[PDB]
């Protein structure tokens, strides 16, 4: 028999402490190890589009209720118009999103793209295996339109359980998506074609058209990793990168919260339809939920007392339903704006903002189709094995106080490396990689009291 | 319909929903039966009971024609709560119950199913969970096998004294139950205002049963009343009106796409299919979690599945710039489409026919459409998308 | 007359493909033509503010109502409180927006401002010609409060059809706007005068006070257009710019989506009032929609039953109305925050993040007053006539692989121009335009294997 549950304190991780130091030099923390890793997000962009029939939902061809309904015919008109406007908004958001997805130009894409990088995202020319894994993991009901109506009809299995056949009972109509999944696949491939790249200035006109690996090295130097390290570790980088990518095959689990959100987007749509269906059986104190039954059992002077009760409650349900749809539609529109923003930042370029994208600085990110939205993956850079080193605010010529320099995108640290005869060395800011100080990694600055006074050998300036 | 919904003669161009087709219903089949005529002979002789002595007849498995019974008496009061009297005669049920009794018509002012009179306070009540009817009637001079009470009688009080001799507990009669006081009251009340008592058993905590009653003079023709209630059910509905099944000419196993039906008095409409036979066997019907019939067992040994019938969604493409329109029938596909519809939607669709009387229907990936023309053009934005890659050009 | 509609596939506009080459050099796509163009957007910032007399809407002061409502008097207080708070929020949002709109300093503005640019947005020294074009195209009823009482009253024309005078029947009050339109116009003139400075190390502390054209040229070098080209094409630039500007006079049609949004904001405000008005005639099963009718024909034991039923439905519609206002007010506040963000980014300065503003990189944008909000216009750059050229990652001295170079905000391309004797040439990235390579266009970089080896003539540096 399993053990009793155990009460426990919530752990609090403590940040690595770095003691403050006085004077002209200071302690510096730098990682000596790193790993690629990924994060994911799901941004819903749409609400499934439906319409209803205030003439088929309330009653079903009984002439007595039709005449009663006429006194309320304007409520249906309000219902229909409201739903119609909601659907127009959904189509607006789709077009607006795609307008930013498209690029004026892109690379062609072939198998083996990305060189040593594995790139499982490539299409089976298609959508992609990753998108299909998502769709398989999703528990959503079998699709509408074709064959449609004939899966309600006896020409099919008795085991069908689709609410879609109930679509033809309840008066529901499910409108088709505007986007067409094949066009959708074309749009996501177009985004992959914009890769390599964003670097090289704005990237808003020109298209670099360079190998994928090269764009990666460019991004790595954009985060303060020295160029020398990048050339030495090229295969290592690809190996760590593909380990992170390979983990995506385990990413389709219930502990993946982005995945969970996708499933709940599906769940919410299904629930809304089920609510209207269940209400068809809801008496309002009426003798029966069936109009024809109460007609058959009652003299007409009393018959429509029962019909009236039934009609009013049915209308009330429809009104509540519409209000809910309008709210959800608006939340989707706002969510779609966010998706558009990330496409124009997190995907189309490396970003310096932190915040957006996965939390590991930023390096290239990717996006794929997901039901009712976009699913993002963010490659990130996670530091490890931080060490503490001595560093100086800057250096100057002790023979001439106006000769003062400071490192660019890096630090001056006391050398701890046997290759360098010089007492100080430059390092990248993202990684511990000391190197000799040269003019390429430094700039002249105004003098400051904290700069070290070097009385001997400084190559930048030599004098 | 669209113009009326927008209260205007100029609806903005777009695609709009319109009401769906009713899907073409067809003539009925039934699986009711069987049984034998419900013997109503207990009413044909002897003296009917005092208001606290009711006779009851439970009817199951049997057939009836209540108008035959109506011919036997003159009815001086007909009323039915929660059901038309015509329907209760024509309805088929899991049970039919008849209560019958002597009743002077001098007391008819005090009797209705909702009455506050002493007859309902202490002698009889009916549940409102079931529809009810009431009949008051008298005996014809040729029905003399039925005979009169010495006097009509009733209990006008029923209470129990508390054992402490200071208070008393009233006992109104429970619906569908004899009053407790019947155990002490005599088969008739010997004199108006007679009262009776019985000591309560110690298991009851002591005290005394108390009851009293009143009488009404005997009349030239016997006067009587009836109470009727019915019970709903599914595969228990063996009580039915006498039925004739000639020239259906067939029932279950004859299809059909939308047919009216009744099974053991359970109405519905739908199409059936020959299928497996999930359990429980012999349970009559089969239902989903929403209490909608799923399918039904039959005496041909065949389980039938039921799909109800399938309505057809409709939408309309409207181009106000050219003042033209076209339509889409949705997922239904052109295989169920015909030049006219009995299914039906609105009294005409001739405005579509202004061009489409001259052309065949066109299938599309979304669905069958009328008056679209397959141009195979590629256009970036129709401002009238049909969904997917479909696009109707103005 | 016209024939049948034509079914068509939705076209998919393919990006221009660029081949992915596999060596030390690559194809580069660069536009050879461009045009100015504009986009517009409407951001609502406020909703119309209303209050409702909670006694007058329910009844006309008939005394039976005056006593009957005492039982429900707390409902009215809740209604008034909720509406009052909603109006306070609208005023808060307006003040907050203007607090950042204002500038500490601006240029004086004169006719002929902006030089050769037409600048039709200038006030007719009033509001502006553009603002009036918008207001004339808008179908909204003329505002009251000076006085407009006599368009209700017998002292005026029989043709008034204003909801405004229906406000004196129903007890509605539309609140006057928080600010005089003239003050608001003054704030946007300050925004016009806030241009130039456009930058230079935040510019919150300074004002450059330079010609509009001059500030534009700095914006143009901000996107990689070379200066030499700009100096030779200045008149050409002015012409293209004014063609884009002139199109705004044709932009105010229902085919303009931003314009359409403005009209619907107006429609919604009027719509809310009409809903309440229509309910005055809505019986709730009461013998008449009029209280006085109910009073005139009934004995008080029945009369009061009829009146209470009538009252209950009237209060119910007021409650739903309040909820509707609370929702809309909140969405307006959020929208106003967005506008504030754009004014302090997309308008006051050039932005490099893309997404925002018009989709053509970014160059100066303008904003004008619009009903219930701000209307933005964004000037942008659209590239055209892209060509592919050969380009290199960098260039080098083959005799000394210990100092190499790479272009700044441009590319090194093989020369195709008869004017330039050099094997390689610098180009701007926004526009194709070869130039000799000089130190102004380059930076020193660490060497890489993909850099070209020049064994002879390379002047930047010669040594
Ligand atoms: C940097 O750290 C990583 C992990 O912390 C090291 O990776 C090793 O990876 C293999 C493969 O999963 C593991 O089995 C080993 O246990 C890992 N080693 C350690 C020490 O965790 C990687 O070798 C490190 N790189 C360095 C120190 O240069
Ligand atoms: C990298 O891409 C290769 C294909 O080049 C993938 O290898 C295939 O993976 C699928 C999925 O399990 C297998 O069915 C195939 O048999 C594999 N190919 C071969 C030749 O064995 C691989 O999964 C991708 N990912 C990684 C991390 O290597
Ligand atoms: C040598 O280092 C000192 C501090 O480490 C430099 O700074 C001087 O500090 C004193 C004490 O506050 C000040 O009075 C001087 O004004 C500082 N110098 C300057 C230039 O401001 C000192 O400059 C260094 N000597 C050099 C670089 O020759
Ligand atoms: C370069 O771009 C300009 C600006 O778009 C082009 O000039 C316009 O071309 C269109 C093409 O139909 C004409 O309708 C306009 O009247 C032209 N305007 C002006 C001011 O010339 C020009 O044709 C382009 N040149 C090339 C070679 O592409
Ligand atoms: C901008 O330039 C346009 C020319 O396209 C001017 O518009 C015309 O101005 C003349 C005045 O001589 C009028 O007669 C025309 O009717 C105008 N054309 C129109 C309205 O299409 C305009 O005045 C200039 N505006 C500014 C601010 O310079
Ligand atoms: C000349 O260009 C080549 C590439 O075309 C430069 O790169 C060398 O390439 C070979 C083969 O890939 C490597 O083995 C060398 O290590 C590369 N050189 C360096 C410095 O890494 C080559 O350097 C250039 N020669 C010069 C500049 O003298
Ligand atoms: C440490 O910093 C303080 C800051 O006030 C300064 O006064 C002092 O000179 C520094 N050095 C020592 C040794 O305290
Ligand atoms: C005999 O009758 C009464 C209850 O009816 C009570 O006084 C007594 O307990 C009964 N005898 C027994 C043995 O229960
Ligand atoms: C159809 O029903 C009959 C019994 O009526 C049965 O014998 C037969 O197997 C059924 N066919 C199918 C395909 O279920
Ligand atoms: C319509 O035209 C397309 C164009 O190729 C053709 O493929 C298709 O068969 C045609 N018919 C239908 C019903 O789509
Ligand atoms: C060039 O082609 C070879 C294979 O022939 C490939 O290994 C190498 O990575 C390519 N260079 C790139 C993509 O820069």
From TrEMBL, chain B:
Name the cystine pairs.
Answer: 80-133
Where would you find this protein in the cell? Virion membrane; Host endoplasmic reticulum-Golgi intermediate compartment membrane; Host cell membrane
Q: Where is the BetaCoV S1-CTD domain?
A: 36-242
In its record, the post-translational modification comment is:
The cytoplasmic Cys-rich domain is palmitoylated. Spike glycoprotein is digested within host endosomes.
Q: What does this protein do?
A: Spike protein S2: mediates fusion of the virion and cellular membranes by acting as a class I viral fusion protein. Under the current model, the protein has at least three conformational states: pre-fusion native state, pre-hairpin intermediate state, and post-fusion hairpin state. During viral and target cell membrane fusion, the coiled coil regions (heptad repeats) assume a trimer-of-hairpins structure, positioning the fusion peptide in close proximity to the C-terminal region of the ectodomain. Spike protein S2': Acts as a viral fusion peptide which is unmasked following S2 cleavage occurring upon virus endocytosis.
Its domain comment says: Fusion peptide 1 (FP1) and fusion peptide 2 (FP2) function cooperatively and have a membrane-ordering effect on lipid headgroups and shallow hydrophobic regions of target bilayers. They are considered as two domains of an extended, bipartite FP. The membrane-ordering activity is calcium-dependent and also dependent on correct folding, which is maintained by an internal disulfide bond in FP2.
Q: Whom does it interact with, and what assembly results?
A: Homotrimer; each monomer consists of a S1 and a S2 subunit. The resulting peplomers protrude from the virus surface as spikes.
Membership in a protein family: Belongs to the betacoronaviruses spike protein family.
Q: What is this protein called?
A: Spike glycoprotein
Query: Which residues of the complete protein appear here?
Result: 346 to 739 of 1353
């Amino acid at each position: 028999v399993p053990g009793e549950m155990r009460l426990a304190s919530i752990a609090f991780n403590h940040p690595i402490q770095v003691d403050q130091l006085n004077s002209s030099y200071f302690k510096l923390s730098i990682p000596t190890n790193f790993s690629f890793g990924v994060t994911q997000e799901y941004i819903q962009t749409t609400i499934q589009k439906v319409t209803v029939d205030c003439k088929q939902y309330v009653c079903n061809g009984f002439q007595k209720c039709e005449q009663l309904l006429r006194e309320y015919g304007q409520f249906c008109s309000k219902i229909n118009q409201a739903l119609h406007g909601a659907n127009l908004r959904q189509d607006d958001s789709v077009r607006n999103l795609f307008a930013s997805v498209k690029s004026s130009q892109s690379s062609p894409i072939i198998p083996g793209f990305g060189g040593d990088f594995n790139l499982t995202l490539l299409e089976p020319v298609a959508r992609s295996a990753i998108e299909d894994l998502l769709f398989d993991k999703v528990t959503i009901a079998d699709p509408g339109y074709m064959q449609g109506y004939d899966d309600c009809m006896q020409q099919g299995p008795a085991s069908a359980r689709d609410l879609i056949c109930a679509q033809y009972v309840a008066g529901y109509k499910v409108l088709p998506p505007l986007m067409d999944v094949n066009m959708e696949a074309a749009y996501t491939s177009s985004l992959l074609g914009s890769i390599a790249g964003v670097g090289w200035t704005a990237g808003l006109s020109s298209f670099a058209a360079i190998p994928f690996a090269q764009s990666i090295f460019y991004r790595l130097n954009g985060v303060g990793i020295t160029q020398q390290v990048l050339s030495e570790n090229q295969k290592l980088i690809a190996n760590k990168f593909n380990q992170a990518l390979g983990a995506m095959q385990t990413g389709f689990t219930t502990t993946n919260e982005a995945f969970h959100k996708v499933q709940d987007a599906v769940n919410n749509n299904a629930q809304a339809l089920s609510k209207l269906a269940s209400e068809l059986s809801n008496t309002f104190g009426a003798i029966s939920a069936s109009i024809g039954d109460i007609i058959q059992r009652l003299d007409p002077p009393e018959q429509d007392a029962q019909i009236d009760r039934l009609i009013n409650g049915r209308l009330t349900t429809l009104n509540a339903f519409v209000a809910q749809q309008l709210v959800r539609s608006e939340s989707a529109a706002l969510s779609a704006q966010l998706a558009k923003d990330k496409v124009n930042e997190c995907v189309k370029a490396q970003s310096k903002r932190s915040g957006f994208c996965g939390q590991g600085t930023h390096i290239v990110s990717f996006v794929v189709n997901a039901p009712n939205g976009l699913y993002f993956m963010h490659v990130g850079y996670y530091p490890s094995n931080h060490i503490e080193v001595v560093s100086a605010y800057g250096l100057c010529d002790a023979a001439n106080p106006t000769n003062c320099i400071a490192p660019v995108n890096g630090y001056f640290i006391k050398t701890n490396n046997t290759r360098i005869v010089d007492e100080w060395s430059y390092t990248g800011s993202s990684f511990y990689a000391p190197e000799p100080i040269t003019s390429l990694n430094t700039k002249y600055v105004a003098p400051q009291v904290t700069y070290q006074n070097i009385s001997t050998n400084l190559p930048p300036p030599l004098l | 319909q669209l113009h009326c919904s927008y209260e205007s003669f100029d609806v903005e161009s777009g695609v709009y929903s319109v009401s769906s087709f009713e899907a073409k219903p067809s003539g009925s089949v039934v699986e009711q039966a069987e049984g034998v005529e419900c013997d109503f002979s207990p009413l044909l002789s002897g003296t009917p009971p005092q208001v606290y002595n009711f006779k009851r007849l439970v009817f199951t498995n049997c057939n009836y024609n209540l108008t035959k019974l109506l011919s036997l008496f003159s009815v001086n009061d007909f009323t039915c709560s929660q059901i038309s009297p015509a329907a209760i005669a024509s309805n088929c049920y899991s049970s039919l119950i008849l209560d019958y009794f002597s009743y002077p018509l001098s007391m008819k002012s005090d009797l209705s199913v909702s009455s506050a009179g002493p007859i309902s306070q202490f002698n009889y009540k009916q549940s409102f969970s079931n529809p009810t009817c009431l009949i008051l009637a008298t005996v014809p001079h040729n029905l003399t096998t039925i005979t009169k009470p010495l006097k009509y009688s009733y209990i006008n009080k029923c209470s129990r004294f508390l054992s402490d001799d200071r208070t008393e507990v009233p006992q109104l009669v429970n619906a569908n139950q004899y009053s407790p006081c019947v155990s002490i009251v005599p088969s008739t009340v010997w004199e108006d205002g007679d009262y009776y008592r019985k000591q309560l058993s110690p298991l009851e905590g002591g005290g005394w049963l108390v009851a009293s009653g009143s009488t009404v003079a005997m009349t030239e023709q016997l006067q009587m009343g009836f109470g009727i209630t019915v019970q709903y059910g599914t595969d228990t509905n063996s009580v039915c009106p006498k039925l004739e099944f000639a020239n259906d000419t067939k029932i279950a196993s004859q299809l059909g796409n939308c047919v009216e039906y009744s099974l053991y008095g359970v109405s519905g409409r739908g199409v059936f299919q020959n299928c497996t036979a999930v359990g429980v066997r012999q349970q009559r019907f089969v239902y989903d979690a929403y209490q909608n019939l799923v399918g039904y067992y039959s005496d041909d040994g065949n389980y039938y599945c039921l799909r109800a019938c399938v309505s057809v969604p409709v939408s309309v493409i409207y181009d106000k710039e050219t003042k033209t329109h076209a339509t889409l029938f949705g997922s239904v596909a052109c295989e169920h489409i015909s030049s006219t519809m009995s299914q039906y939607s609105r009294s005409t669709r001739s405005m579509l026919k202004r061009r489409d009387s001259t052309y065949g229907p066109l299938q599309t990936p979304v669905g069958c459409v009328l008056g679209l023309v397959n141009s195979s053009l590629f256009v970036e934005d129709c401002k009238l998308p049909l969904g997917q890659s479909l696009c109707a050009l103005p």
